[PDB]
RNA sequence: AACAGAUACUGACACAGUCCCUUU
RNA sequence: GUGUAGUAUCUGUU
């Protein structure tokens, strides 16, 4: 059964899925990817004069409640 | 039309710079981690020059790096967490001049994912267990042990999952031959995703949680969970057991706090501010990295600020109860992403952007001209000045 | 409903399945009340055989799965009907009752079933008590035991009667038995619940508490010694103050507890119990004897004990009191004594036991000979033969041949023992080989055709050791003798002879085989027509070996005859024969050109037998792999034009199998088959599209990493419109093809394809698009990070990732 | 086995135990039943490798003879990083075949 | 309307901020020199013969087969992180041959139908020509 | 549309298997 | 030859 395998993973949707939560998942995954790779974090820390620790803290803070409150 | 990729110069940007005894001798080496290059360095203990011995390439994104040694052992190991869904233990060979893979275990898919561990790599101070965690919901514990043939072994992973949680930092707690314990800076988001008004996003605070590994029952259970005041960014391990007390130092914006489970009133000390600072008063102030120099006589911490000031934290305690935290200004160096203090009196500064420097500690900076600051004293200021407790000997 | 139940009860499989589907789907809407009211008496009808009962429990399982909440007022009756099924001599019946009760528990409130089972706890009948205890055990295995811990704690201390405490401890024991090592986090609670009964005063509760603590210790084999700390003193007192059943239970419990401890505790407690064990070795009852055998083997298999200590105390009384012939009657004592002796040999050494037992190895009794044979065989299998000296190996050889030469009936034990011994000895059996050869030849000579097959198995076993001992002449003589023995009538003996011949041919090469293959293969050819599995297997393996390695000595006409024979043989009812046949086709097509064999295979695609055609397609793919693909590909593509449907399906399946077989060197043939795949993927028939999707999946997985995305994009464009199907097989094929194309091309193109209908107004399209999106998302989401489309934000919600727009 | 929709995988977190295959299932892939290019060893969770179940066949439950493996296609698709592939169900064909034979 | 065709893909693993084609060593051939945000400097060079291309491809395949990445990653999957790799041969993995153990060296070279010194010379010639 | 009958097809689907806790 | 899951196309009665 394929549907049990996909149900457990976090991020998968279904027919009754709204757009806000889909983009919330997109944003959370994007923040985690930014934290993961190194040279992308270097890019972000050079584009604005902030230490990498500050950028990491800001990204972690934005993980809670992105894209505004729900409807 | 086929092309052939070649390299003339490898990356020279340090990301993790753990240290230890890897050659099995009395000399200490530094294992630095570039983006995808694993390199091992040996500073000269007589002329101060830094030399390179191995520059292997791993073809992957290294996300975490820590070292440990088994109790009664002499040679340290290397633990690597990366984008591959595996944990790998390495071991240096001075004779062959190479890294040998001792163990590897698979626990999930590949790539820098949200719910696949590999971000945090806390290890037990004695060497009895290791922990790998994800940013969300995934934590696995492995138990290390030795056999009759003097070889390390690994057990099956133990799961400590938790739904709808985020992890800021994970560190191992020095418990002194008791059940190994791990402390994490968790934070929940279940309710905030269910409040249209949006006040539930506010009033949500971090909780410091302790995970105790039950060796007798072979399972992990969380015991303590206390809400915090500010939002911490990273934790520090306090040497406990026979020397010093247990617990963890929590670093937040404009504060540093000591906490411990069971029965302890926490102690908070504000971070000193630079005198005649030109910055906007709106912004806060945080620490970026730290270090530890535990020794038989005493132990002290080091900490780096955003501006680039090195403090010297000393804990003052009763027979077993801690009383206050004493901060003192040590020196100022370029901002770094990792610092390490070795024996023989050397400081290695791995700058996060630019050249790297090696300093020799000539004075420990005690009872000098500058005053000290304490949590018992009822916004401190200090005057930065050129180097007094450091001498530069090498530049990379 | 009654007609559907009756049709399921007996009838033809097609109408039975149809009635089953109807009484599931429509009778869910009809209602559960009357359904159970009419079904339950059928199962509770006495003198009913097992077929109808199995069918009725199947239909109840289906309706219970489809109807969960509505069965709440019927749980009592369901338990009454199903609960006796828990106690049965059939593993399948026990299992099926287990998931029936588990599904009912998961489809009903726990409090409801607890209250239902309360009135049946206070009973003394051997049936009701045991069945209720096991029902509680499986119910607690489901739903988690913490939900039932307070109830067990309350009921274990019930003062209404002792039997309530007995039932509570029995429930704990059954939970330990069934749930296994999934109880380690909750060990201490159960230990605390049962220790009170352990320290009680009545014999029954004491015995059941000892049994439950033994079950818990067995569940936690490597862990939990700290949790077992309030029961040590009661056990070490009870062993001294008890006689009979209680003593046996306490001994079992302490034996299970011993391995958990550390070294010092192990040795102290093992001697403290060794005193009573040595006292009890001469117990008249057999159950006590097997229990103390288990206890002594557990104590011996512990780090704490010492080899010399065991040798000085345990060995003499054990050998004096247990190595006799009266215990040979029962199988349990047989197993326990054999395994305990093997473990003791592992502890002290192989020689210390072999030297003791080889003397009576050749005892006049037969069961004693079987016992010593099994013991020596296991000891040789584990330890080996390094500990055996010259006299010991001489005595062992004389004993084993003497025992084997007197074979009263069929017995695999002696043959396995002889084979193990001769393999373990290795080169050292060189002086004894001629006697073995003479004995095996004599046993192969005549005598009722019952020992010849055993001799054939023996020579097939010992061919390798005679090879290592440089005795090719004797095995060559045996091979030629078997060659004249190839014509006997009995099938089993013929299969054994063929196996021996195959073993010899493998052992000694075909360049110097004493019976030339030029005389062997024509002799083997008519044997293939024997419609018996045992003969056919060995014959086809021997033929395949000769074809693979000895193809130089056979003429092409003989190969064509045996090819026709293989074409006939592809009709076997067992898969191993068919796999051997297709391998032989491959070897023959390597030996000769791939033209004559291809025509015979391509003409076999109209036999109207589904598995025959599948095997022929696999054989065609094997030929296409062993030879170069472009030799046979034009013939297959030309053959595709036949108007018959089965021929086209066979061609497509052969293409899929070939593309699976060849991974890298398959990019040179994508162009040749692209028009044929485009023709196949057209909306006229389902099976063509299914098989073409399978071909696409295998090809895309094969060519991954070699930059052939241009034609794969076209194939994706042709295969995409098939996802809106309903038949499960076509759905599976299409999803597999899509996953393979996602791996070969990249997640960006698949995301672009699935990004249009992901919010379609129709409900029956969004689910399909979401299944496809989930399949794409689970694999390589970090690429989806960089492949996401830009979204314009709403009035209150920010939907733009501004971090990626930074520019240096 | 992919030929029976009714069968169910355990797919819990895998441990250090190694899976085994009987004589009938030898040489197959525990996911797709393919004989081509075994690639990676199969591991099972400690609940599957306990007591009587130790050293039994992954697919059908018979006595273990040889190790289990993942085919190259499954390794490429990363289907090996999913948990223990041990089958926990008994199937509908097996029980009905047994009952028909014991008619 | 009209679309462009992708003819090459790769994954350096480090963000690139400069691409520029020129000649480095006098008397050599021009190459596509690039520099990355982490401090690395690399080049991409073409093959002078088809035999060289097949040889290097087969060497890369064998080294990927028997010399896996140290940290447990898959080299081909790493190089196809976002888009599948196309018409690029990784030279770092190929040059990892020169520091391998002698037994594996002779095994791989015999699979190459060459002796290890010949493989070393062949690997060094392209680097000493282009750079 | 529902009830019923008939004919074709797919799944390298399978073939005395065997039970490997069945507790006192 | 039989049994375990499915599928397609025809014919009769409402
Ligand atoms: Zn499992
Ligand atoms: Zn099997
Ligand atoms: Zn597979």
């Amino acid at each position: 059964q394929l549907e049990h395998l996909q149900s457990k993973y976090i991020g998968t949707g279904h027919a009754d899925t709204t757009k806000w939560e889909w983009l919330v998942n997109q944003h959370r995954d994007s923040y985690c990817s930014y934290m993961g790779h190194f040279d992308l974090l270097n890019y972000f820390a050079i584009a604005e004069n902030e230490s990498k620790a500050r950028v990491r803290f800001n990204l972690m803070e934005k993980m809670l409640q992105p894209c505004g409150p729900p409807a | 039309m086929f092309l052939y990729n070649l390299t003339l110069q490898r990356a020279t940007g340090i990301s993790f710079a753990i240290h230890g005894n890897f050659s099995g001798t009395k000399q200490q080496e530094i294992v630095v981690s570039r983006g995808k290059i694993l390199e091992l360095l040996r500073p000269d203990p007589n002329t101060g020059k830094v030399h390179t011995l191995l520059t292997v390439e791993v073809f992957g994104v290294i996300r975490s790096l820590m070292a440990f040694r088994l109790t009664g052992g002499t040679k340290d190991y290397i633990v690597v967490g990366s984008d591959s869904g595996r944990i790998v233990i390495l071991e240096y060979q001075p004779s062959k001049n190479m890294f040998e893979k001792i163990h590897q275990e698979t626990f999930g898919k590949s790539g820098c994912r949200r719910i696949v561990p590999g971000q945090f790599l806390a290890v037990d101070p004695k060497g009895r267990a290791v922990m790998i965690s994800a940013i969300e919901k995934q934590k696995l514990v492995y138990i290390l042990n030795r056999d009759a043939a003097a070889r390390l072994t690994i057990s099956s992973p133990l799961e400590a999952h938790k739904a709808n949680t985020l992890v800021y930092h994970v560190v191992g707690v020095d418990v002194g031959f008791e059940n190994p314990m791990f402390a994490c800076l968790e934070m929940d988001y279940e309710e905030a995703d269910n409040d249209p008004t949006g006040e539930a996003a506010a009033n949500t605070q971090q909780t410091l949680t302790f995970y105790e590994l039950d060796l007798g029952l072979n399972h992990v259970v969380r015991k303590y969970s206390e809400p915090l005041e500010e939002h911490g960014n990273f934790l520090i391990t306090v040497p406990g057991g026979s020397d010093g007390p247990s617990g963890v130092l929590i670093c937040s914006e404009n504060y540093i706090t000591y906490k411990n489970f069971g029965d302890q009133p926490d102690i908070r000390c504000p971070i000193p501010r630079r005198r005649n600072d030109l910055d906007d008063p709106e912004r806060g102030m945080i620490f970026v990295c730290s270090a530890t120099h535990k020794t038989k006589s005493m132990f002290f911490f080091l900490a780096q600020t955003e501006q680039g000031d090195i403090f010297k934290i000393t804990l003052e305690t009763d027979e077993d109860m801690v009383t206050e935290i004493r901060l003192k200004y040590f020196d100022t160096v370029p901002v770094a992403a990792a610092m390490c203090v070795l024996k023989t009196g050397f400081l290695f500064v791995a700058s996060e952007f630019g050249n790297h420097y090696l300093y020799q500690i000539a004075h420990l900076g005690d009872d000098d001209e500058e005053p000290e600051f304490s949590s018992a004293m009822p916004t401190f200021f200090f005057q930065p000045r050129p180097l007094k407790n450091l001498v530069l000997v090498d530049e990379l | 409903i009654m007609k559907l139940l009756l049709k399921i009860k007996n009838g033809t499989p097609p109408m039975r399945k149809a009635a089953l589907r109807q009484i599931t789907d429509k009778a869910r809407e009809f209602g559960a009340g009357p359904l159970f009211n009419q079904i339950l008496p059928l199962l509770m009808s006495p003198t009913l055989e097992d077929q109808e009962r199995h069918l009725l429990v199947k239909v109840i399982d289906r309706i219970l799965y489809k109807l969960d909440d509505l069965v709440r007022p019927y749980v009592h009756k369901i338990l009454v009907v199903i609960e006796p099924l828990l106690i049965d001599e059939d593993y399948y019946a026990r299992v099926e009752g287990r998931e029936i009760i588990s599904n009912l528990a998961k489809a009903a409130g726990l409090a409801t079933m607890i209250s239902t089972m309360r009135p049946d706890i206070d009973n003394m009948d051997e049936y009701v008590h045991n069945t209720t205890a096991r029902a509680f055990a499986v119910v607690a295995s489901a739903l988690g035991i913490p939900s039932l811990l307070p109830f067990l704690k309350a009921v274990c201390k019930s003062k209404k009667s002792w039997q309530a405490r007995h039932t509570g401890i029995k429930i704990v024991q059954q939970i330990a038995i069934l749930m296994g090592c999934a109880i380690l986090p909750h060990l201490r609670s159960l230990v605390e619940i049962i220790e009170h009964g352990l320290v009680d005063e009545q014999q029954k509760v004491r015995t059941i508490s000892a049994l439950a603590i033994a079950a818990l210790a067995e569940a936690a084999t490597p862990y939990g010694i700290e949790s077992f700390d309030s029961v040590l003193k009661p056990l070490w007192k009870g062993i001294r103050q008890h006689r009979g059943k209680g003593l046996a239970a306490f001994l079992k419990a302490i034996g299970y507890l011993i391995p958990l401890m550390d070294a010092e505790y192990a040795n102290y407690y093992t001697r403290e119990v060794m005193l009573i064990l040595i006292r009890e070795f001469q117990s008249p009852d057999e159950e006590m004897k097997k229990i103390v055998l288990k206890v002594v083997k557990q104590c011996c298999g512990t780090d704490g004990v010492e080899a010399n200590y065991i040798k000085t105390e345990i060995l003499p009384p054990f050998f004096k009191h247990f190595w006799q012939h009266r215990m040979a009657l029962d199988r349990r004592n047989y197993r326990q004594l054999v395994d305990t002796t093997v473990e003791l040999a592992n502890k002290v050494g192989a020689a210390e036991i072999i030297s003791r037992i080889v003397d009576d190895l050749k005892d006049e009794a037969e069961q004693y000979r079987k016992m010593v044979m099994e013991t020596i065989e296991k000891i040789m299998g584990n330890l080996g033969a390094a500990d055996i000296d010259h006299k010991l190996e001489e005595q062992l050889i004389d004993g084993i041949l003497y025992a084997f030469q007197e074979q009263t009936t069929e017995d695999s034990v002696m043959l396995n023992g002889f084979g193990t011994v001769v393999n373990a000895l290795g080169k050292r059996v060189k002086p004894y080989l001629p006697q073995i050869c003479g004995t095996v030849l004599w046993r192969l000579n005549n005598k009722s055709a019952k020992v010849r097959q055993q001799a054939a198995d023996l020579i097939s076993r010992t061919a390798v050791v005679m090879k290592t001992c440089q005795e090719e002449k004797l095995m060559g003589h045996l091979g030629v003798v078997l060659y004249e023995y190839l014509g006997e009538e009995y099938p089993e003996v013929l299969g054994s002879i063929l196996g021996a011949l195959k073993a010899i041919v493998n052992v000694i090469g075909m360049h110097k085989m004493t019976p030339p293959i030029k005389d062997l293969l024509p002799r083997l050819t008519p044997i293939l027509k024997n419609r018996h599995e045992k003969v056919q297997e060995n014959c086809i393996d021997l033929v395949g070996r000769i074809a693979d390695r000895g193809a130089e000595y056979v003429s092409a006409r003989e190969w064509m005859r045996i090819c026709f024979e293989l074409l006939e043989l592809l009709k076997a009812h067992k898969k191993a024969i068919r796999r051997a046949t297709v391998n032989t086709f491959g070897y023959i097509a390597k030996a000769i050109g791939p033209h004559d064999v291809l025509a015979t295979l391509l003409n076999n695609l109209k036999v109207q037998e589904r598995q025959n055609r599948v095997c022929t397609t696999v054989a065609i793919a094997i030929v296409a792999e062993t030879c170069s693909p472009f030799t046979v590909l034009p013939a297959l593509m030309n053959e595709y034009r036949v108007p018959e449907l089965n021929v086209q399906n066979g061609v497509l399946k052969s293409l899929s199998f070939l593309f699976e077989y060849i991974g890298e060197m398959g990019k040179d043939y994508i162009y040749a088959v692209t028009p044929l795949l485009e023709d196949a993927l057209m909306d006229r028939d389902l099976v063509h599209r299914q098989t073409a999707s399978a071909v696409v999946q295998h090809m895309s997985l094969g060519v991954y990493g070699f930059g052939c995305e241009d034609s794969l994009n076209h194939l994706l464009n042709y295969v995409w419109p098939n996802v809106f199907e309903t038949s499960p097989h076509v759905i599976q094929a299409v999803m597999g093809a899509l996953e393979g194309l996602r791996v070969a091309i990249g997640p960006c193109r698949m995301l672009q394809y699935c990004l249009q209908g992901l919010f379609h107004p129709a409900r029956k399209v969004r689910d399909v698009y979401w299944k496809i999106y989930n399949s794409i998302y689970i694999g390589s989401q970090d690429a989806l990070i960089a492949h996401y489309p830009r979204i314009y934000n709403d009035d209150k919600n920010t939907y733009i990732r501004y971090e990626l727009d930074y520019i240096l | 086995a992919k030929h029976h929709p009714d069968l169910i995988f355990c797919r819990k977190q895998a441990g250090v135990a190694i899976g085994r295959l009987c004589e009938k299932c030898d040489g197959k892939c525990v996911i797709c039943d393919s004989y081509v290019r075994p690639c990676t060893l199969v591991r099972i969770c400690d609940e599957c490798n306990y007591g009587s179940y130790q050293g039994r066949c992954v697919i059908c439950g018979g006595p273990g003879v040889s190790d289990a493996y993942y085919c190259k296609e499954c390794t490429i698709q990363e289907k090996d990083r999913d948990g223990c592939p041990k089958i926990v169900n008994l199937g509908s064909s097996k029980t009905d075949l047994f009952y028909e034979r014991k008619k | 309307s009209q679309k462009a065709e992708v003819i090459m893909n790769y994954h350096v693993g480090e963000t690139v901020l400069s691409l520029q084609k020129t000649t480095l060593i006098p008397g050599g051939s021009e190459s596509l020199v690039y520099t990355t945000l982490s401090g690395g400097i690399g080049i991409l060079v073409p093959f002078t013969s088809h035999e060289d291309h097949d040889f290097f491809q087969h060497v890369e395949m064998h080294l990927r087969s028997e010399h896996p990445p140290l940290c447990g990653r898959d080299h081909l999957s790493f190089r196809s992180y976002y888009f599948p790799v196309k018409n690029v041969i990784d030279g770092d993995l190929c040059e990892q041959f020169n520091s391998m153990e002698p037994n594996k060296q002779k095994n791989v070279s015999e699979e190459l139908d060459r002796t290890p010194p010949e493989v070393s010379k062949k690997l060094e010639d392209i680097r000493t020509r282009y750079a």
Side-chain angles (χ1 to χ4, degrees), chain C residues 13 16-17 21 58 573 727-728:
Chain C
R16 180 178 56 202
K17 166 180 62 177
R21 261 181 87 100
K58 208 175 155 190
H573 286 168
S727 75

Side-chain angles (χ1 to χ4, degrees), chain C residues 394-412:
Chain C
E394 285 179 302
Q395 186 154 15
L396 171 73
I397 281 300
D398 306 325
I400 180 54
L401 286 86
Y402 182 76
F404 179 54
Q405 273 154 100
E406 47 188 3
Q407 186 76 254
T408 314
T409 61
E410 57 203 331
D411 273 327
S412 299

Side-chain angles (χ1 to χ4, degrees), chain C residues 381-433:
Chain C
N382 313 117
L383 276 300
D387 303 334
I388 291 182
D389 206 73
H390 202 102
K391 180 67 174 66
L392 189 40
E393 61 200 344
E394 285 179 302
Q395 186 154 15
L396 171 73
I397 281 300
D398 306 325
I400 180 54
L401 286 86
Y402 182 76
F404 179 54
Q405 273 154 100
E406 47 188 3
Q407 186 76 254
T408 314
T409 61
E410 57 203 331
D411 273 327
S412 299
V413 178
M414 314 294 316
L415 189 152
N416 291 288
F418 189 86
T420 315
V421 170
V422 301
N423 295 320
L425 267 296
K427 171 255 294 175
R428 312 290 316 284
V429 73
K430 179 174 179 64
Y432 317 97
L433 271 176

Side-chain angles (χ1 to χ4, degrees), chain C residues 660, chain D residues 28-34 36-37 69-75 77 79:
Chain C
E660 196 182 15
Chain D
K28 278 197 268 191
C29 189
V30 291
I31 308 286
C32 52
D33 305 77
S34 176
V36 193
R37 297 184 180 89
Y69 279 89
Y70 286 110
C71 84
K72 185 94 202 152
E73 276 186 342
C74 290
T75 298
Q77 299 189 265
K79 292 176 154 220

Side-chain angles (χ1 to χ4, degrees), chain C residues 172-297:
Chain C
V172 176
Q173 178 209 35
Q174 295 300 118
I175 283 157
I177 277 161
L178 174 64
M179 194 159 159
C181 67
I183 308 171
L184 205 43
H186 314 146
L187 176 63
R188 314 191 31 101
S189 298
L190 293 156
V191 167
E192 283 301 314
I193 293 170
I194 64 187
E195 62 179 40
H196 186 273
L198 175 62
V199 302
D200 201 275
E201 59 86 20
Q202 180 174 41
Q203 265 282 3
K204 322 296 295 309
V205 295
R206 281 174 273 159
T207 52
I208 192 65
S209 56
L211 299 173
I213 204 160
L216 264 62
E218 187 191 38
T221 49
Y223 313 112
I225 190 52
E226 302 306 287
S227 180
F228 291 112
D229 217 353
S230 187
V231 287
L232 292 158
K233 300 289 100 176
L235 288 174
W236 290 108
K237 284 175 232 163
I239 63 153
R240 295 199 259 247
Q241 323 304 100
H242 289 77
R243 304 301 211 131
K245 282 184 194 342
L247 181 43
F250 275 62
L251 281 168
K252 185 187 287 186
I254 187 52
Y256 273 109
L257 277 187
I258 281 285
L260 276 58
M261 306 174 180
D262 298 329
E264 41 273 27
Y265 292 171
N267 74 14
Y268 182 30
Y269 290 124
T270 189
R271 45 174 50 78
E272 191 171 317
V273 74
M274 211 166 58
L275 271 293
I276 311 295
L277 282 184
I278 290 171
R279 200 276 292 296
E280 274 276 319
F281 286 166
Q282 51 272 70
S283 314
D285 172 35
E286 76 291 338
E287 304 166 352
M288 312 210 68
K289 292 193 255 225
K290 73 174 190 174
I291 278 172
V292 303
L293 283 157
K294 181 48 168 155
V295 172
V296 69
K297 74 177 281 192

